Design a binder for this molecule. Sequence first.
Ligand SMILES: O=c1cc(-c2[nH]nc3ncc(-c4c(F)cccc4F)cc23)nc(N2CCC(O)CC2)[nH]1
Ligand SMILES: O=c1cc(-c2[nH]nc3ncc(-c4c(F)cccc4F)cc23)nc(N2CCC(O)CC2)[nH]1
Lengths: 398, 398
Amino acid sequence: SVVIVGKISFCPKDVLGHGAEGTIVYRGMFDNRDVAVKRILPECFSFADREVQLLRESDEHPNVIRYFCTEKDRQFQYIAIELCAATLQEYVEQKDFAHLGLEPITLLQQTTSGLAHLHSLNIVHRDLKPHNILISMPNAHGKIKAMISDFGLCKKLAVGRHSFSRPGTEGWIAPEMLSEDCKENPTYTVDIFSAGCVFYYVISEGSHPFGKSLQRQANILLGACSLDCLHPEKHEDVIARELIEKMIAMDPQKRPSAKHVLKHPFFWSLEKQLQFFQDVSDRIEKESLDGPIVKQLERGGRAVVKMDWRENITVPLQTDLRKFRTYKGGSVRDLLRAMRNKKHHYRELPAEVRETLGSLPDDFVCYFTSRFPHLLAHTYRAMELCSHERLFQPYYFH
Amino acid sequence: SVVIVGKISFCPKDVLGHGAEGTIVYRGMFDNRDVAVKRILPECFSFADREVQLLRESDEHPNVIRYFCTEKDRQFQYIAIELCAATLQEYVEQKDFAHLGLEPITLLQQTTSGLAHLHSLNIVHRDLKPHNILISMPNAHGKIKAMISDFGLCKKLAVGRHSFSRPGTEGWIAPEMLSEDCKENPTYTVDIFSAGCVFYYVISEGSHPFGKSLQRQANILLGACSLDCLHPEKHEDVIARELIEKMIAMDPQKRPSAKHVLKHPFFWSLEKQLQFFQDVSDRIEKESLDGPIVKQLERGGRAVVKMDWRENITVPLQTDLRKFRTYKGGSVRDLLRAMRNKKHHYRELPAEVRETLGSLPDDFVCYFTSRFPHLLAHTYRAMELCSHERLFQPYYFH
Ligand SMILES: O=c1cc(-c2[nH]nc3ncc(-c4c(F)cccc4F)cc23)nc(N2CCC(O)CC2)[nH]1
Ligand SMILES: O=c1cc(-c2[nH]nc3ncc(-c4c(F)cccc4F)cc23)nc(N2CCC(O)CC2)[nH]1
């Protein structure tokens, strides 16, 4: 048997998966396209109408699933949406990450862009989780992308409203959604909390900041989280830790907006990381040693530099830097100056110094972030003071 | 009377416009959306099938019109596509540009991105013109965008094919499409030619490089073009001239690809223009005065600098530059060094010098491009020598 309800066609044997309250998702056809066909019981008709409306408003963004058509009969309602290759859950559960490069982080970036688009339309998702972040089928050039789906529980905030009244999948629910200690009503940042748990789930390849599945939601309410898959002496893990712990903060007002998340160093290219180092080096160049900028930059600076940073770089660099200026080994500012100096004059340096540094910009900046895993995170926090100036708008969100 | 053919609905009184060979475009409805409904006579059924197929392949890009559904009856075929607010023709014919800022150039950028997407799918449009570049209706944040439409005459090149055999709207047709002197078959660059004529049509607010409409196509075949709406001593017009004359070159092999067009200074922000000046200044710093780079950079450099560039800047800058280095007034390289110098030390300079320059980066770079209208175009051409190096990949297409 093969079902045809209006312009939507599918065969009941092609079941892709199941949702809540009797929802089934089939592989099907619409307008000679392969599509996913979502079948909703009459008890959930008000959720399908909500989903259809909110998909019409937001599916123009590439990281929101495309919506095609809807139709009803006597029995059910049918929603035709973009057919996808996998969920993020099975991507994390099945794909070998060793040879995927930055693709996992790109999926998180695309998820966040789709979330930012929803929030810019005053839509809160409220049920974000790996099960409904979808991985597209490859396009004509083999590229895949993440898409947000499943809009049955979304809330459309009225014009002039920033909060909603008080719904999700246990284990991924922001605490202010379930605790009665609700000073403020929940807002867009409930999606930031869930996203933060998703971020950790992807980069840890399967763990959750609030533990194993049976205890997860109870740990969220207690604030008991652990990010120990992130090693504290690895640059990439330090950066990810800094972002994720803000995304999952118990206080919703301390969580960054989606657009704020998108500006974080977690997503910067290596080229952009080096440009941030150069730009901060120039900003603090003629700065006062007693000023608030260099004060913030040097507070806790001893551990960032490893007591004396000149003792923690390769000898060919160490012999080269003694000649011209001779820098201060306990200053983070002086570490940044040496980096800036060696990048600007990179092609004047002898072949021995260009060898241990590597090429500009990627290898060069990794020479430093590998050996000073806290440098970028520390510098990024200190220079929040300059987040409003023009030079630093590529790096901070206003 | 109100027509309903399948899931497409429209009323024959809501005519938006007409196309070739009896095609009519109506305002209509599909799935409770407002849509454009394209009605095609049986004589053009093979073109509607071509359009439906190629829209299915390419409408995912934001600057290709979105396709919704198609249906037939006894009489006609109907295509439901995104409803748009205007054509580029009426935009140019009716909108006051004085208060639109960079919006016209952004429309050209978006058109080119849609074209690049088609070409990346081995689709040549072959009938690009202001009449079928559409202006979207504003989104929820008031923003508009350009979209390519009308795919009835598109060619899908077979896998492994780069040319097609030998169709358009008179006045916008690349010469190799009509002249029998066809050494090479037409390729994607027929769309570049048309686009180049569209570029000039927008920035001149209604003119065409090959003249008035009755003589246009005859001038194309003769190679007789004129871009004299572009003043030769205005930076923005110099840059646009440089691009447009390559886009409309008679020799198709001299026209840049769509992705090449997208990298041209015509589309650079002011910030990016200044960064190009700084990056070239650093690249030629320790360069040999006899080398090929500085040779190319100085060839024809006297007119770029206006005999002596130190005599063509404001006196407060002139008094400031004499102090430290004292530069050479006939060298383009030295002009670039002074610029680079004053940007790097911008906050060390006295208030008089920061005043006549303006703020970084926008006013600062305009101080120089306003007074040396050929500087950027000249520097961009000379430094094509370095187009392959890593530092200059933001500026040239490989
Ligand atoms: O709103 C929606 C939209 C979609 C959806 N829309 N296009 C899709 N293409 C493929 C799949 C899919 C699958 F079903 C199982 C394994 C791999 C797959 F790729 C799902 C798709 N699916 C759900 N559900 C609820 C949450 C469940 O975890 C999954 C099904 N809800
Ligand atoms: O393939 C296509 C798709 C569309 C099309 N698709 N959505 C549209 N929304 C609005 C308009 C539109 C109009 F019709 C007249 C004035 C202002 C407008 F905005 C046209 C639209 N139109 C044509 N034609 C052929 C070339 C003609 O110059 C125009 C009509 N061809």
